[PDB]
């Protein structure tokens, strides 16, 4: 899954 | 009326919710600080810094949606607030609004007296321009830590995670106490399939800001990618707990979506008993079950 900056 | 203000807000009554909001950013933390700023925005809609602080707080609280709504007010009210532009670039990058992300990076740069004089499918030229302006800024000022942060965001948007992490790495050497920058390096590393390295970054970020809910969720994401579901569980208990503090009628949906992610992990790790108890919405029993509290 995608991590958030 | 475009921002979904929280109805149950004790901070609307208060006399000085902004100074309180600013105290809570460090000492209680994000959900409560956001409520305080929410109260200031309702009362004095023209206070750019009320909108700005709310937007950055919301993004840190895992709500880019509301962040964006908020920061766009601040941006209208003071278009030279570089902090709002930088934050806009981050939330949009996260929300995959490429054009806006690039326009927020451009604006972030050209709103600075220092730098104002100055293939990616979704927006080839917008990106070309950004990469050129930002790289030109970098030879004016090779050690602007925020220039490196911005190249990091740029390169995240184009999935050049190697080059992003390099710039974000130079950035944390210049500013090793910046939790924001650590998270960014963290997400860069996670998204570039370097999850163990990501956690190192995320762990620096939490040491600086133990209420940084976005970082806790990120950590859960990476531990889940590496199928270490107990560690993931632990971070999502902290995430769910921290992101509420108070009581929250948009917000329901952020909370529930996090409960759902954790619940799905409980299913994946074979705890049917713990899966059912999520519906109740009480975090504490999970804090105890996952070694967080007595």
From Swiss-Prot, chain A:
It is found in: Glycosome. A motif (Peroxisomal targeting signal) lies at residues 3-5. It comes from the Eukaryota. Catalyzes the phosphorylation of D-fructose 6-phosphate to fructose 1,6-bisphosphate by ATP, the first committing step of glycolysis. Homotetramer. Belongs to the phosphofructokinase type A (PFKA) family. PPi-dependent PFK group II subfamily. Atypical ATP-dependent clade 'X' sub-subfamily. This is ATP-dependent 6-phosphofructokinase. The gene is pfk. The chain holds residues 483 to 487 of 487 of the full protein.
